[PDB]
Design a protein around this motif. Structure first.
Motif: not given
Ligand SMILES: Nc1ncnc2c1ncn2[C@@H]1O[C@H](COP(=O)(O)OP(=O)(O)O)[C@@H](O)[C@H]1O
Ligand SMILES: O=P(O)(O)O[C@@H]1[C@H](O)[C@H](O)[C@@H](OP(=O)(O)O)[C@H](OP(=O)(O)O)[C@H]1O
Ligand SMILES: [Mg+2]
Ligand SMILES: [Mg+2]
Length: 239
Positions: A157-161, A163-167, A198-199
């Motif tokens: 699961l791409r949790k980075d994406a 969190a970025a989406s929330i922001q 670092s995508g």
């Protein structure tokens, strides 16, 4: 939607009144002589607009030339989410209202509807797609896992994406909480993240403006949908 190698897309105007309304929306926002701070801020969240376009030999055939929001990505994962409690506009007939509510009778309760997604799967170097019937089949019980699917690349699961989406959605919500001049029906957020260490590039842009109207109120249904979507994404961070 025609994808062009110059980093733009051409969106054909829908029949009247929808196509003309979407054209006028873009013309209003991107007017070169605009000094309205609300509209100048809105530009950041829309595809860049390059004006009306027609083929040289066909002035009849009208398109909007827009930034291709996916252009800077190698393997873009894309999801389109319709936002709001109502997907019909203030001038819809009884039949149109019934049609639109019947397409997804949970819109009032959930405040968003996944229209489709295309997700890159790393292990197979291939895409998995979901069509309009996927999102229309999601309920309160299944909405979290339904959305999660967009961020799962076959091995994690791409949790980075997430969190970025929330922001990024939060900045859009802030814009909405600071304007009372436009209400948006049947419009969408387009989510893009990089599927291919670092995508971290992510885009969230507002699209599809055939049913935007002048208003004197906060767009309450839109705000409700953004808040609910943020709530769902936030829970996905706890997976
Ligand atoms: N500016 C854009 N950049 C990249 N993709 C886009 C853009 N605009 C639209 N699309 C893609 O095309 C699809 C349909 O576009 P949209 O404006 O929603 O048309 P419609 O009015 O037919 O629903 C979107 O779901 C999205 O995947
Ligand atoms: O995707 P489907 O299943 O074909 O259903 C369409 C979808 O709900 C569109 O968003 C809607 O356009 P609007 O958002 O502009 O209302 C269209 O109305 P239409 O048939 O009146 O074009 C529907 O037919
Ligand atoms: Mg659309
Ligand atoms: Mg549309």
């Amino acid at each position: 939607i025609l994808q062009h190698p110059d980093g733009t897309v051409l969106k054909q105007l829908q029949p009247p009144p929808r196509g003309p309304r979407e054209l006028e929306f873009y013309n209003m926002v991107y007017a070169a002589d605009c000094f309205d701070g609300v509209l100048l801020e809105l530009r950041k969240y829309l595809p860049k607009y390059y004006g009306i376009w027609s083929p040289p030999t066909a002035p009849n055939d009208l398109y909007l030339k827009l930034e291709d929001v996916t252009h800077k990505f190698n393997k873009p994962c894309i999801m389109d989410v319709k936002i709001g409690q109502k997907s019909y506009d203030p001038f819809a007939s009884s039949e149109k209202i019934q049609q639109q509510v019947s397409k997804y009778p949970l819109m009032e309760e959930i405040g968003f509807l996944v229209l489709g997604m295309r997700v890159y799967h790393v292990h197979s170097d291939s895409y998995e797609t979901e069509n309009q019937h996927y999102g229309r089949s999601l309920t309160k019980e299944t909405i979290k896992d339904g959305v999660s699917r967009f961020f799962h690349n076959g091995y994690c699961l791409r949790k980075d994406a997430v969190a970025a989406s929330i922001q990024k959605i939060e900045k859009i919500l802030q814009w909405f909480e600071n304007q009372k001049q436009l209400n948006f029906y049947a419009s969408s957020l387009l989510f893009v993240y990089e599927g291919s260490g670092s995508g971290g590039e992510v885009e969230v842009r507002m699209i599809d403006f055939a049913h935007v109207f002048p208003s004197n109120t906060i767009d309450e249904g839109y705000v409700y949908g953004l808040k609910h979507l943020i709530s769902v994404l936030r829970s996905i961070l706890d997976n």
